[PDB]
Structure formats: structure tokens, C-alpha cells
Design a binder for these strands. Structure first.
Length: 78
DNA sequence: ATTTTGTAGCTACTTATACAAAATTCAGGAAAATTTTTCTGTATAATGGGAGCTGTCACGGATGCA
């Protein structure tokens, strides 16, 4: 009831990579993945909203997808 | 009348054997060394996209119908 509760914003992020590559939907997922992870690695004790932390993990997730594939010959993401 | 042919012959004399360890190298292993690939985090806040295309057909359907 939180990961989904967010939903939007992650699409505002993923959509930035919908044109970068992969696929709007493809992205969305990826984020989602992240979303999760964040969604729980996350600590309301530091107060400031997940908007300044959830979006972190997202981004991460994503990048690791158009770089992890979307190329049909995987190269050292590094 | 020597010479070539001999015969009755060996001895020297040299392959032949086979082994043989000694080389002598090679391969594989093993690391170990290290280089390259992976993995993970990131704290103000951030909360719906892109596009357009716009000139046959057919048919069977067309359910849908009024």
C-alpha cells in the first residue's frame, strides 16, 4: 500500500529513460523494482520525505537496465 | 708368367639389437597475480507521454439496427 501508493513520480523518473532507451513500460518496471527496495530501505527518522531518497533508488534501478541490456551486446556498464 | 682366377680362408670388421638411461624437451597446473567485472548507495524535493495520421479494400460482417 506504499510502493503502488507512490506509482507516479517513478513514472516521471522512468519516462526520462523512456526516450533514453529500453521502453516506457520496460522502465516502469525497473523503477518499480527499485521502488520496492527503497520502499523499504527507508527510514522515517530522518525525517525528510522519500522524495529525497526513494527517488534515489529508483534512478539507480533504472540506469541498471538500459545499461544492463537495451544493447544487444552487453558491454562493461563501467 | 702374371694375372686373374681361387679357395678356402681367416681376421678385422661393421653393421644390427635392443636397451637405456639419460637427456630434453613440454604441457598443464597451479598459482597467483591482477585486471575487469560486478554491486550498492545517493537524503532539500521531485508525482501521468507522444503523436498526427488523416486518399484502396472487403468483406464479411455487420452486429446492430432502427
Amino acid at each position: 500500500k506504499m510502493v503502488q501508493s507512490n506509482l507516479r513520480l517513478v513514472v516521471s523518473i522512468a519516462k526520462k529513460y523512456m526516450n533514453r532507451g529500453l521502453s516506457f513500460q520496460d522502465l516502469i518496471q525497473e523503477g518499480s523494482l527499485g521502488l520496492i527496495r527503497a520502499a523499504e530501505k527507508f527510514d522515517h527518522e530522518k525525517g525528510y520525505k522519500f522524495s529525497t531518497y526513494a527517488t534515489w533508488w529508483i534512478r539507480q534501478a533504472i540506469t541498471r537496465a538500459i545499461a544492463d541490456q537495451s544493447r544487444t551486446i552487453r558491454l562493461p556498464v563501467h
